[PDB]
Design a protein around this ligand. Structure first.
Ligand code: FSR
Length: 350
């Protein structure tokens, strides 16, 4: 059986449309979650707001809505990557836009009323990427939640990857990297690539500040890399044999930091079958980012499970760290919300 959890609810399902590519964002101070996804016939991005009530151990989700401004004319919108700027009280949604040779665009919308309304999009593509743009076939952000650092500038870090046209007889090769802003998203720089054949990724900060990057790969195991200079360079990287990737070219997964009961630990979710996208597991790194220290997975959901996104939700009703998880289930017929505590998942680590 799978781990007892506080809540398991389908929050998007196939209907008139298909739902994929989840992203989850906790809003501290609001006891609220935003759950985003692509609404495909890709076309648009939709959002549901959930209010978390601890005494009933549950989130009540409001009605789904299109993020009408997260779009460019004649383009499909993909890869919702949200971020909450603690310093401003501003909500960011990053996304890519592709027309209905590199033609992919990086976009941002912004909200100051917690996601109820949104600015008109800004196209960041030229200023963020620059001459490199023509050396890529395409690129993406996230998908999923991004990162704010507690450096002086409270920098914004958007995980990403680009397919680089490195040798003309070879097909393009993907490498992960981060977009970086030090002025609250007014300007953007491209950090340096991690390593050949890394795809979708996410980043988390631990403590010496370290940004840990966890990425999908072509191999049978995850790639993880670490930056000591806040995402500009992931000076080191390697395979993480304890973290399996299934055929043919892996699956996206999510990583967050959260405060250590004993200053942070990591939590990571991803399908656990080496053979297929099934059996969503949670894994713990209590000595991060050491790759050796990743635990054995504990089972969060049986059956078909694919992309996920995690959020730290503060303290849970049993007093241990509370987590939210949004994941694609059941051969992509739904996106399910799961809520559970550290005590429930890793009782031996408490
Ligand atoms: C995931 C998927 O594997 O199901 O794949 C993404 C990839 O095709 C990519 O990472 C491999 O290059 C895809 N992203 C885009 C921009 O199409 C996701 O849509 C998909 F869910």
């Amino acid at each position: 059986a799978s781990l007892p959890v506080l809540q398991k609810e389908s929050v998007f399902q196939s209907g008139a449309h298909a739902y994929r590519i989840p992203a989850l964002l906790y809003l501290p101070g609001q006891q609220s979650l935003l759950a985003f996804a692509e609404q495909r016939a890709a076309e648009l991005i939709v959002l549901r707001r959930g209010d978390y009530d601890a005494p009933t151990h549950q989130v009540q989700w409001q009605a789904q809505e299109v993020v009408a401004q997260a779009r460019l004319d004649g383009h499909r919108s993909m890869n919702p990557c949200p971020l909450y700027d603690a310093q401003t009280g501003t909500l960011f949604l990053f996304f890519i836009a592709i027309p209905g040779a590199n033609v992919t665009r990086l976009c941002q919308v912004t909200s100051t009323d917690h996601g109820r309304t949104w600015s008109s999009p800004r196209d960041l593509t030229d200023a963020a990427i620059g001459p490199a743009y023509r050396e890529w076939s395409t690129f993406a952000v996230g998908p999923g939640h991004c990162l704010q650092l507690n450096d002086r500038a409270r920098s914004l870090v958007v995980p990403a990857y680009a397919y680089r046209k490195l040798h003309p007889i070879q097909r393009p090769i993907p490498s992960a990297f981060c977009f970086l802003s030090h002025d609250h998203g007014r300007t953007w720089a491209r950090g340096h690539f991690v390593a050949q054949d890394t795809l979708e990724c996410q980043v988390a900060e631990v403590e010496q500040r370290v940004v840990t990057l966890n990425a999908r790969s072509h191999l049978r195991a995850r790639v993880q890399a670490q930056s000591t200079n806040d995402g500009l360079d992931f000076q080191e990287s390697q395979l993480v044999k304890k973290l399996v990737e299934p055929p043919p070219q892996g699956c996206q997964g999510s990583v967050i930091s959260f405060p250590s009961p004993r200053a942070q630990w990591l939590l990571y979710t991803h399908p656990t079958h080496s053979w297929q996208r099934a059996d969503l597991g949670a894994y713990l790194n209590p000595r991060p980012p050491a790759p050796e220290a990743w635990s054995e997975p504990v089972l969060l959901a049986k059956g078909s499970c694919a992309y996920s996104d995690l959020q730290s939700m503060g303290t849970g009703p049993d007093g241990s760290p509370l987590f939210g998880c949004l994941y694609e289930a059941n051969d992509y017929e739904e996106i399910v919300f799961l809520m559970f505590t550290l005590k429930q998942a890793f009782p031996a680590e408490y």
